[PDB]
């Protein structure tokens, strides 16, 4: 015979009925492998105009994305969104801080007012004399460098002054930047996500309330590339206006639509004029909306449903919420999502806001939902907590990339663009997983065991 | 195109087959928001004649509703039902106590027999002399007030006597009431549930056994507004008679039908002449009937099924049992319920019967089913226990209201009347939730976390 | 209108497809109540010829049924089966012991050989002299009683001798029995299960292996009323022969067929000539067959399927295994079962074999499957353990009866015969229960709680 | 009537839709028993050319199969596969070591270089003198034996020298072997799996990467009988080539195809020229692929689907992964599998690699997946751990055999060949198991319990 039938379920019959299943409810039948995993191209679109080397994106939460994270993320190939739980000024600062970050050049030099350099030497010896400028008269005659400044002469010249951060200025003695030694052989970031001006990409979230139009402005000034509207149910006249307002004012600016879960919700945003859709309502580890409200939708189905529609307009979808492991990323992407947003899966990370604090013989790192009472009487829709400890976004992300690539390989696709083309064509196959199938899917029948991922 | 199909399940296909699903088995797809949550009107009917500002209702259990609770509940916009685990006299007392409660006026002044006022002063100094009247001859010549008594002159006049509870009498020196300082700026209860005589509404539960006709009488005297028949299976000739007996005797009185779960059970009660139906069999946190019997029905389905029928007669349905969180309330209401009754979700509360007693580094408050051996050889159908500690019904209820409103908003309804009109029309959409969907629905992927709701 | 549709699932569509559901997977919609629970008649058949006042039956396990249990059970209205884990002689003894038990008369007087009465007096005072008969010459001239012996003169006469167990003999000084004081006002057992000779009924289990034909014989002699073949898969040529062998030899004797789960398995036994069928394979608390084999079937479905067939021949079915609570009994009976057999649910009991032994601040009582390595290289198909502590079969059983009656009432049936007639007619309604429905079905949303059943 | 319908589900309708169920999701309805369990023949094929007495097969993991295991397994009637986590030389050694193992003859005599025998005597008395050959001049004149060596004269002759391991040599004083006393009455292995040269069978796993062709060679030399390609997704051009390469070079050699789960994946391997298929992706206790990727399939369905196809070509299927108990073996075999491979279920065993180390008052034995970071930045797809303690493969396996036989009996098949013929014909019946059915399936309703299997 040499036939072999067409066993396997198609996306349609699996996510277009009314059962409402999530990532852990299904699998993806393998295909034919004839290329190595690293040959898999993960290039994907974040918006109608922007494209990242990797589909990963950090969430706009006060415990996940902040300068450091938006930078690492961008450097590793993804992008980040600065949360909006702080006066517009500060949030806007985190943007410019990112938007004008340059290899080797000092991050954002801590500084003080006279109220010249100031090397520890002084601070030590010789009562706290009348202010700093006094206890520190660092003569104009000092080791500084001209605008011809470069990483080359920098470090080297630093040897003469045996210092590790010589200052640089344009012409009007107003520090443009300070080169720094601290790393000893900077790596190369070939996938770095940057804009036209070669600066790293940077996103930012804002509300849809009136007092957010000013906030947006400060961000816009700072060179923000894309902004996402923060809402649990983004299909409101408020967001729609907020959309129009922004698109009009700033034509040259991408706007991602508030969190939606239905094709109907999307229609309004795609019409308002959005550049993408953030799909996901009540899937976040810290989000507890479905339990305290009554509205929401199972992630896997939501991502599939909203993408199949959004695609018909060239509007990328960001699968936000529900990604509890590498696996769930490939899943979300295979269902129509162009990129995926993470929060908890990127909390412990060292680039994330906050500091670690061992608790009960185990590592730790704060992490809560922006809808929690702390982050914010108001009805709490989120919870507060903390997670373990992962490596650094510079090594963690690369691991995610390998997984996603290994996933694509097992399936038979050499790119994410293909994975989607396959599932929409009916070539990509799926299969439901019973509770026992889920149990067998993970670790079982062991007396004890540990786990290390990369 | 600009079409977007009609994705979404309708109530019918979801609760009218035979799967028997509960609140945690489904969700409600969001709609369009074009109004703020606080604009949502929660007005709902408790019976054919009565209407509350809020659909909340405390349960007739000896650990939930009692004077204090029936008062707070009424003040916050809902209503309460005094349990019937105590001689009719006492239960009847709790009613009048409620029915004639007035702002500022002392609750129910504790008192003693001679066997004039009696300020601590005496009790202290000068052997327990022959009875109270002796160890306390408080002269007729004392600070008291005339029927012109008002909160105005009251407190003020109290200053002269530097006391905090001057007595007031009509004419025949028989204390009608005592004004009291103890609060320092009473709030305003705009939603208060009151009757024609401007007195707070008050409900009361009674059995269907013969010896309950006298009990009902004492309650009726006390000015009870509505009574609910307490039974697990209320479709018995006993209740039906008890219905007729009451409707006849007291025409001007609402009667809620025993707990039912089917349209067939309802028919008998709607015919007997009930003013509402209490739907719910074996859903209560402390009820364990389904485990020790064989009869019952999944709450969500029961509420939907009995309401779709009851509505065809203008008979309100009270979704009693199964409400484990704010979310489940909106759910019950969206399925055809006019109001919802709670027990455990209103136990810890300070207005509830009993006192707290820290246990294992944690707060506590007794709570058990009226079907438990303690509350009541008889077959125990309930269990006994206790819960944590919530705020006060004066702040807790308001939180429930916000939730329910936030829920209605997310859906797209500006009132509960609308939410039901939407689900019966097919506009309101639902989606089943798999076990994984339920797991993703709540908190997951966190190393640890705490939870605060309002 | 006044119609009300026909909501509700019928047994057929619920247990005749291939889903394989158990008791916890469904419920029984209530009906109309017009009679009190105690008016419910539980009379049910155990075999084609025998009938018990109650459908309860103790299991033939070395930790459940033994003389004491087969007696209490019979007295409370049910029946018991002596296990066969002991030489035929001893098992046969437990039978006669039961079969000839009489109110007041000493159970089975412990005794010694000379190698007259022997009151402690002696044992105490005056070296262990040459044997008992010597250290105890209780003269012929002693307080004894004639065959006219009766509970009347007995106790009374005992006063004169101030003893508590005067001996009685026929004529040939061979103790027929000894009356005993130890209770102080024996109760009345109106439901007692007895045979023609007014003796309590008694069952007994035997294997189907060759060496079991002798064992059966000793039992037969002892006046056993019914015997059950002990097998996990009773549809073997071995049992079929064993059936024929017995039916032939002892026509006047009931034989219950080995454990089966299908209508096909039953056909062979009903033809071999059985008087009943023990349905249930791998449902017992201690049975772990399904996990270590590959054959078996979900109890609820098995009971329904085998009964619908067996009934077509007047062959009663004993729902054995899976009854984890009062509720599951009514369920099994409502599906076609005539009686139900229990093991674990009757372990802690005081009438059960073994003694209690507090462990970890909690009561205890051994309990294991006859298929366990201990009870019995052989493949273990059962496990060994222990349970808590229930009352006495004289109070526990009565509780089960109330439940079963309360269950029948809630449904609307005044007898078990009716409950079955209702489910087979399509009048009795059912509804599946989702996992959440099962969770809501039991205790939930409580911070803590205890449980007392009767 | 005497008909009895055809209740029961067929494999087809149960594993050929898209639900994806595992072993714990179904059962096998019993049939007719007319033969004893030990009469059941378990003979099954491992490949197109090879046949084992028992369908058991140890997995190629560095914690399961290694010489000792491949020997015991072969002796008990099955076969084993040496893992490939060690230079080809060593892995190849483990093969020859096995391939030339002979009863009584010393396993693999530990040895040292001069850098004659060497009995402890010396080592003790008389500074570590210049090397061994010196501190030990065991004269040529010593107790040794000629090629006529046999277990007969061996042991006996050993008495004269009162030693326990006399050396034997061919002619050129180059030890061919050493007979040893250490057991005191060697048993008989009637089912031993051997090749034409009467040597025990031995399998070995290799990768499909280029540098594996040399490795294969060393194994081939050592007399390996069958080799299995180690891959999670074995349907790649790499394996297909690796297949062709081997089949060509070594015609007289069996090759088992990489792990597959679909009929489509199989087609390529059956065409490449494989002798069997290893079905199973992400079912292993230590495999966590489905959780960190997105591809895989529920074992039960995979085994059924791939076998129904593979059989159409006479290509045996090895159900690898998911076997958590005796029961699951019969299940896998009944669905079309010819043999089953185990890992964890054969870890604790004494023949397995590694030594035990009590931990927390309990026994222990290391066990991890070859995909774990330890066994192997790379993406970890497995985990590391350890299990309890089972007996010895010489007693454990026999237990598995009894189970599998007991299973076959309960069904009604006298051989595995029959079990499959029955399920493909539609005679063998199945039934799904709900979560409650699964709960009832195992141990429940017990206050406590222990477990011993054989
Ligand atoms: C905000 O972040 C989230 C996100 C992204 C998600 C979830 C979530 O719970 C949160 C936290 C809660 O966000 P939100 O539900 O509070 C939405 P939002 O922040 O826009 O607040 C909405 C309310 O603000 C008021 N509002 C919004 N815009 C205006 C406006 N233009 N004028 C007046 N009032 C407005 C209304 O009361 C409207 O209901 C979730 O479950 O899935 C995704
Ligand atoms: C009473 O509260 C509940 C409620 C409200 C619920 C559940 C529950 O378990 C209880 C506790 C138990 O109530 P109930 O089942 O004991 C019902 P009820 O209190 O009316 O007692 C009923 C029995 O009393 C006797 N009875 C009732 N009325 C009469 C009568 N008129 N004459 C004689 N006997 C009567 C009968 O034996 C009838 O079976 C439940 O599972 O869902 C809701
Ligand atoms: C015995 O009790 C049970 C019961 C009642 C149940 C289960 C259970 O596991 C046990 C314990 C195990 O009983 P069994 O499976 O060992 C059945 P049985 O005691 O009859 O032993 C059967 C074997 O004995 C041998 N045999 C039986 N009769 C003969 C015979 N006539 N001649 C020769 N051999 C025979 C055969 O090897 C036959 O397979 C269960 O899962 O559901 C109900
Ligand atoms: N409910 C809340 O308080 C809250 N806080 C954040 N979120 C949503 O959950 C997402 C993160 O989900 P996760 O941690 O990847 O499961 C965020 O991007 C945001 O959309 N929700
Ligand atoms: N079974 C019992 O003892 C018992 N006690 C109270 N109840 C029922 O449960 C309801 C409360 O449910 P809950 O606590 O909101 O889940 C009560 O209103 C009553 O109808 N049941
Ligand atoms: N597998 C075993 O060892 C074993 N031992 C007893 N049993 C079966 O289980 C039944 C008791 O079930 P349960 O305890 O009521 O769930 C017994 O009547 C018997 O049929 N099974
Ligand atoms: N993922 C991993 O690291 C790993 N290691 C081994 N395995 C697979 O799992 C199988 C063993 O499964 P189990 O232990 O019987 O459930 C092995 O034969 C192999 O196919 N997988
Ligand atoms: K969630
Ligand atoms: K309950
Ligand atoms: K069981
Ligand atoms: K697994």
PDB file of N, CA and C in Angstrom, chain C residues 112-118 122-123 125-138:
ATOM      1  N   UNK C 112     -11.876 -25.690  79.228  1.00  0.00           N
ATOM      2  CA  UNK C 112     -10.636 -26.424  79.457  1.00  0.00           C
ATOM      3  C   UNK C 112     -10.957 -27.903  79.757  1.00  0.00           C
ATOM      4  N   UNK C 113      -9.920 -28.739  79.666  1.00  0.00           N
ATOM      5  CA  UNK C 113     -10.054 -30.173  79.911  1.00  0.00           C
ATOM      6  C   UNK C 113      -9.532 -30.509  81.301  1.00  0.00           C
ATOM      7  N   UNK C 114      -9.973 -31.650  81.856  1.00  0.00           N
ATOM      8  CA  UNK C 114      -9.515 -32.051  83.191  1.00  0.00           C
ATOM      9  C   UNK C 114      -7.994 -32.094  83.189  1.00  0.00           C
ATOM     10  N   UNK C 115      -7.435 -32.321  81.996  1.00  0.00           N
ATOM     11  CA  UNK C 115      -5.988 -32.405  81.788  1.00  0.00           C
ATOM     12  C   UNK C 115      -5.283 -31.111  82.158  1.00  0.00           C
ATOM     13  N   UNK C 116     -17.373 -30.308  86.182  1.00  0.00           N
ATOM     14  CA  UNK C 116     -17.805 -29.293  87.142  1.00  0.00           C
ATOM     15  C   UNK C 116     -17.249 -27.888  86.890  1.00  0.00           C
ATOM     16  N   UNK C 117     -17.986 -26.870  87.351  1.00  0.00           N
ATOM     17  CA  UNK C 117     -17.569 -25.478  87.172  1.00  0.00           C
ATOM     18  C   UNK C 117     -16.176 -25.241  87.784  1.00  0.00           C
ATOM     19  N   UNK C 118     -15.608 -24.060  87.544  1.00  0.00           N
ATOM     20  CA  UNK C 118     -14.271 -23.723  88.052  1.00  0.00           C
ATOM     21  C   UNK C 118     -14.187 -22.205  88.288  1.00  0.00           C
ATOM     22  N   UNK C 122     -10.641 -20.797  93.524  1.00  0.00           N
ATOM     23  CA  UNK C 122      -9.556 -21.772  93.534  1.00  0.00           C
ATOM     24  C   UNK C 122      -8.264 -21.291  92.883  1.00  0.00           C
ATOM     25  N   UNK C 123      -8.304 -21.106  91.566  1.00  0.00           N
ATOM     26  CA  UNK C 123      -7.136 -20.645  90.809  1.00  0.00           C
ATOM     27  C   UNK C 123      -6.181 -19.788  91.665  1.00  0.00           C
ATOM     28  N   UNK C 125      -5.660 -19.065  95.504  1.00  0.00           N
ATOM     29  CA  UNK C 125      -4.924 -19.670  96.617  1.00  0.00           C
ATOM     30  C   UNK C 125      -4.617 -21.162  96.582  1.00  0.00           C
ATOM     31  N   UNK C 126      -3.973 -21.615  97.671  1.00  0.00           N
ATOM     32  CA  UNK C 126      -3.583 -23.024  97.878  1.00  0.00           C
ATOM     33  C   UNK C 126      -2.810 -23.621  96.699  1.00  0.00           C
ATOM     34  N   UNK C 127       1.229 -23.799  94.624  1.00  0.00           N
ATOM     35  CA  UNK C 127       1.824 -24.433  93.439  1.00  0.00           C
ATOM     36  C   UNK C 127       0.727 -25.012  92.545  1.00  0.00           C
ATOM     37  N   UNK C 128       0.896 -24.903  91.226  1.00  0.00           N
ATOM     38  CA  UNK C 128      -0.093 -25.437  90.288  1.00  0.00           C
ATOM     39  C   UNK C 128      -0.191 -26.960  90.407  1.00  0.00           C
ATOM     40  N   UNK C 129      -0.986 -27.436  91.382  1.00  0.00           N
ATOM     41  CA  UNK C 129      -1.182 -28.872  91.645  1.00  0.00           C
ATOM     42  C   UNK C 129      -1.449 -29.671  90.365  1.00  0.00           C
ATOM     43  N   UNK C 130      -1.261 -30.995  90.463  1.00  0.00           N
ATOM     44  CA  UNK C 130      -1.447 -31.890  89.319  1.00  0.00           C
ATOM     45  C   UNK C 130      -2.773 -31.676  88.603  1.00  0.00           C
ATOM     46  N   UNK C 131      -2.676 -31.013  87.449  1.00  0.00           N
ATOM     47  CA  UNK C 131      -3.800 -30.667  86.578  1.00  0.00           C
ATOM     48  C   UNK C 131      -5.013 -29.992  87.221  1.00  0.00           C
ATOM     49  N   UNK C 132      -5.901 -29.529  86.343  1.00  0.00           N
ATOM     50  CA  UNK C 132      -7.133 -28.838  86.711  1.00  0.00           C
ATOM     51  C   UNK C 132      -8.174 -29.657  87.502  1.00  0.00           C
ATOM     52  N   UNK C 133      -8.548 -30.821  86.981  1.00  0.00           N
ATOM     53  CA  UNK C 133      -9.553 -31.654  87.634  1.00  0.00           C
ATOM     54  C   UNK C 133      -9.219 -31.841  89.115  1.00  0.00           C
ATOM     55  N   UNK C 134      -7.921 -31.851  89.417  1.00  0.00           N
ATOM     56  CA  UNK C 134      -7.464 -32.002  90.801  1.00  0.00           C
ATOM     57  C   UNK C 134      -7.599 -30.688  91.587  1.00  0.00           C
ATOM     58  N   UNK C 135      -6.904 -29.637  91.127  1.00  0.00           N
ATOM     59  CA  UNK C 135      -6.971 -28.306  91.755  1.00  0.00           C
ATOM     60  C   UNK C 135      -8.397 -27.773  91.689  1.00  0.00           C
ATOM     61  N   UNK C 136      -9.327 -28.637  91.293  1.00  0.00           N
ATOM     62  CA  UNK C 136     -10.716 -28.237  91.147  1.00  0.00           C
ATOM     63  C   UNK C 136     -11.683 -29.409  91.100  1.00  0.00           C
ATOM     64  N   UNK C 137     -12.064 -29.897  92.277  1.00  0.00           N
ATOM     65  CA  UNK C 137     -13.016 -31.002  92.341  1.00  0.00           C
ATOM     66  C   UNK C 137     -14.401 -30.407  92.661  1.00  0.00           C
ATOM     67  N   UNK C 138     -15.020 -29.815  91.643  1.00  0.00           N
ATOM     68  CA  UNK C 138     -16.326 -29.231  91.844  1.00  0.00           C
ATOM     69  C   UNK C 138     -17.376 -30.320  91.856  1.00  0.00           C
TER      70      UNK C 138
END
